Design a protein around this ligand. Structure first.
Ligand SMILES: CCCCCCCCOCCOCCOCCOCCO
Ligand SMILES: CCCCCCCCOCCOCCOCCOCCO
Ligand SMILES: CCCCCCCCOCCOCCOCCOCCO
Ligand SMILES: CCCCCCCCOCCOCCOCCOCCO
Length: 404
């Protein structure tokens, strides 16, 4: 998910700054760099995880806070069969999460009138890969995976007269419902979208992933994996447009939205992992999320009986280059403590921008040598993005790999 595109997935990878390319990082490697999967301890792994995110947004004097938690699964298994590793897992996760609720100015119709409309968002994505890793020459490990993605979303966005007009001017907002709803909303209104068998407003695309590894030294590994842009489908499902008059009179139309071109771009990451001491470990990858390679427009069509409304949004997103280092010491044949960091390189309270800086802590507590527990937590370092607004996330994951 991450509401634009970044790096770092997995219980042990999150802890190491989202490094992943060259080394082992559990079954998440299925959605990271399947080649890496080869390094797995002989046998058949079987992890269970609990990924967790939460954002604290503070938009503005006019305070509007975010919180007023979605926890996702991680059933995965990676069987072995000489030189050949085979895995398949489900990987649920949030990333987009806000709940300003109905009380703040985001709920203030033009003319600062308090509507009782909610302002919230939640994008959930469940990746589900099926791939493999292969040992070709105790130096070359190839691996790839093809996953079924299932995106779901629910919004509670409110737009004041102003920006609805702004959307018109820009040549973004077309419709038919517009003419007619104009003059009822007027320079003092606000429109409001609400998505909640009930469609749910979800989609079902496909994802691709292939990567390699090369033991350059016996203390240096080189890695790379290409990530095909996921082919999500169209987000479809019941929704409710509510023209709100310049004084609070609500006109609710019920129809069905269709979000088109929700892009999750491709990415090529390159990294290494050195171990200049049979205890202390270090990792480092450079990621490239190819956003500039997205030229079409995200289209939000809404259809009711009385008519429709549509918003076009062209992409215009340049490339994102993520650099990230990792590390991991072994307190002993029990504890393993890791810690990494990763620097990455339209105020809209309901969809906060990805953060660039990140600090990550974590460790691993083995207790069987056939069972293990990984624990990671990543800090989204605060950025200050008229409407001043700022936020900072806290991601925490925990997986228990019962080496069968
Ligand atoms: C965008 C998420 C998909 C959910 C559909 C809701 C569609 C509603 O409109 C989103 C448009 O937001 C843009 C802001 O308002 C325009 C302000 O003027 C800015 C000029 O760049
Ligand atoms: C997105 C919600 C739809 C509700 C539309 C009400 C917003 C309309 O505009 C208010 C600004 O007034 C000026 C617009 O021009 C008059 C009619 O609209 C025609 C545009 O093709
Ligand atoms: C050779 C042994 C490993 C020693 C540490 C490796 C550290 C290597 O470099 C990592 C570079 O990436 C992180 C830098 O901070 C981000 C700066 O902006 C750069 C553009 O991507
Ligand atoms: C034997 C080692 C002990 C390590 C335990 C790690 C588990 C401890 O907590 C980590 C932080 O908790 C994360 C999320 O909050 C709990 C929510 O409920 C989740 C399942 O529905």
């Amino acid at each position: 998910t991450q509401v634009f595109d970044l790096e770092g997935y997995g219980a042990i990878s999150r802890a190491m700054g989202g490094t992943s390319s060259s080394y082992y990082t559990g079954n998440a490697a299925l959605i990271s760099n399947p080649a890496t999967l080869s390094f797995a301890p002989d046998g058949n792994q079987f992890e269970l995880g609990l990924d967790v995110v939460t954002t604290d947004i503070k938009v503005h004097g006019a305070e509007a806070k975010s919180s007023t938690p979605y926890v996702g699964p991680q059933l995965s298994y990676v069987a072995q069969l000489d030189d050949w590793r085979f895995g398949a897992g489900l990987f649920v996760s949030s990333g987009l999460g806000t709940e300003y609720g109905s009380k703040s100015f985001l709920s203030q119709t033009e003319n600062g009138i308090q509507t009782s409309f909610d302002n919230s968002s939640r994008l959930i994505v469940l990746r589900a890969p099926i791939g493999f890793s292969y040992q070709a020459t105790s130096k070359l490990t190839f691996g790839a995976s093809v996953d079924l993605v299932w995106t779901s979303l629910n919004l509670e966005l409110l737009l004041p007269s102003s920006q609805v007009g702004a959307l018109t001017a820009q040549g973004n907002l077309s419709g038919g419902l517009v003419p007619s709803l104009a003059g009822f909303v007027g320079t003092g209104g606000a429109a409001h979208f609400s998505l909640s068998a009930g469609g749910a407003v979800d989609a079902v695309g496909w994802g691709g992933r292939l990567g390699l590894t090369y033991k350059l030294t016996d203390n240096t590994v080189l890695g790379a994996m290409y990530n095909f842009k996921t082919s999500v489908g169209d987000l479809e499902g019941k929704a409710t447009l509510s023209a709100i008059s310049g004084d609070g009179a609500v006109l609710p139309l019920d129809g069905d939205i269709r979000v088109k071109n929700f892009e999750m771009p491709a990415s090529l990451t390159l990294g290494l992992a050195h171990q200049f001491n049979e205890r202390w470990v270090v990792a480092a990858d450079i990621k490239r999320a190819y956003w500039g390679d997205v030229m079409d427009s995200m289209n939000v069509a809404f259809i009711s009986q009385l008519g429709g409304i549509d918003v076009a949004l062209p992409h215009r997103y340049q490339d994102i280059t993520v650099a990230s280092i990792g590390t991991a010491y072994k307190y002993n044949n029990d504890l393993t403590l890791r810690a990494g960091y990763s620097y990455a390189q339209l105020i809209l309270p309901v969809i906060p921008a990805y953060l660039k800086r990140h600090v990550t802590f974590g460790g691993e507590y083995d207790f069987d040598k056939d069972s293990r527990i990984n624990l990671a937590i990543s800090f989204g370092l605060r950025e200050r993005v008229m409407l001043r607004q700022s936020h900072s996330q806290i991601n925490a994951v925990v997986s228990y790999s019962k080496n069968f």
